[PDB]
C-alpha cells in the first residue's frame, strides 16, 4: 500500500524498475571489466581502477532510482541480473568501446523514460532525471570518448607501448 502516491503512473513505476535492472547490469559489467584488467597477464591497474570506479557509480545510480521509486510511492521489483556480455575484454580500446556502447544504452533508456514522463505529465520525474542522470551521462560519455581517442591515437603508433603509456599517464 501507499498513502503518498500522486501523479505517478504504473508505466513510469515499471520503467523505473527496468532502469534499476539496467544500472545494476552495468555495475556488474564494470566489475568484470575491472577485474579483467587486474589479471596478472593484463596488469593495467589504472584501467582496473577506472572500471571499478564506474561499477560503484552505476550501483549508486541504481540506489538513487530505488530511493526515488520509494519517495513517489512506487514499489521496487527486482529481476534476475544477466551476466556481462564477455568473460574477457580484449585490448584497452576494445574495453573503452564496450563501455561507450554500455553508457549509450543507459543514456537511451534515460531518454526513453524521460519521454514517458513527459507523455505522462510527470514533471518531478523529468527534473529528477535531468539534474541527477542525464547531465552525468553526457559528461561521462564525453570523458570516455576522449579516452578512446587517446588510446586509439597511441595504439596506432605502437600497441604495447601505447597501452602502457595511456594507463600510466592518463589513468
Question: Cβ 167 to Pd ion, closest distance in Å?
Answer: 11
Residues 6+ apart with CB under 8 A from 41: none
Cβ neighbourhood burial of 4 (10 Å; 0-12, 13-18, 19+) = exposed
Q: Does 141 bind a copy of itself (CB under 8 A)?
A: yes
**Contacting a copy of itself (CB under 8 A), which of 60, 71, 90, 94?**
71
From a copy of itself, Pd ion, none, which one binds at residue 7 (CB under 5 to 8 Å depending on kind)?
a copy of itself
Q: Does 14 bind a copy of itself (CB under 8 A)?
A: no
Consult the annotation and say whether 137 binds a ligand: no
Consult the annotation and say whether 45 binds a ligand: no
Tell me how far apart the alpha carbons of residues 72 and 22 are, in angstroms, rounded to a whole number: 20
Q: Does 116 bind a copy of itself (CB under 8 A)?
A: no
Residue 99 in grid coordinates: 563501455
Tell me how far apart the alpha carbons of residues 117 and 61 are, in angstroms, rounded to a whole number: 18
The residue among 11 and 104 lying less far from a copy of itself, judged by its C-beta, is 104
Tell me how far apart the alpha carbons of residues 13 and 93 are, in angstroms, rounded to a whole number: 37
From a copy of itself, Pd ion, none, which one binds at residue 84 (CB under 5 to 8 Å depending on kind)?
a copy of itself
**Contacting a copy of itself (CB under 8 A), which of 60, 70, 90, 94?**
70
Total site size for a copy of itself, rule CB under 8 A: 86
**Contacting Pd ion (CB under 5 A), which of 60, 94, 130, 146?**
130
The CA angle 12-14-19, to the nearest 5 degrees, is 90
Q: Residue 20 in contact with residue 65, Cβ under 8 Å? A: yes
Amino acid at each position: 500500500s501507499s498513502q503518498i502516491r500522486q501523479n505517478y503512473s504504473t508505466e513510469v513505476e515499471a520503467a523505473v524498475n527496468r532502469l534499476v535492472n539496467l544500472y545494476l547490469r552495468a555495475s556488474y559489467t564494470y566489475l568484470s571489466l575491472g577485474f579483467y584488467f587486474d589479471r596478472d597477464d593484463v596488469a593495467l591497474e589504472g584501467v582496473c581502477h577506472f572500471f571499478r570506479e564506474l561499477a560503484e557509480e552505476k550501483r549508486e545510480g541504481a540506489e538513487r532510482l530505488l530511493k526515488m521509486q520509494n519517495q513517489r510511492g512506487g514499489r521496487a521489483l527486482f529481476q534476475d541480473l544477466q551476466k556481462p556480455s564477455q568473460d574477457e575484454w580484449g585490448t584497452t580500446p576494445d574495453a573503452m568501446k564496450a563501455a561507450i556502447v554500455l553508457e549509450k544504452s543507459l543514456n537511451q533508456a534515460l531518454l526513453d523514460l524521460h519521454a514517458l514522463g513527459s507523455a505522462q505529465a510527470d514533471p518531478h520525474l523529468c527534473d529528477f532525471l535531468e539534474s541527477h542522470f542525464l547531465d552525468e551521462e553526457v559528461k561521462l560519455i564525453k570523458k570516455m570518448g576522449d579516452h578512446l581517442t587517446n588510446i586509439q591515437r597511441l595504439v596506432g603508433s605502437q600497441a604495447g607501448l601505447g597501452e602502457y603509456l595511456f594507463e600510466r599517464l592518463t589513468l
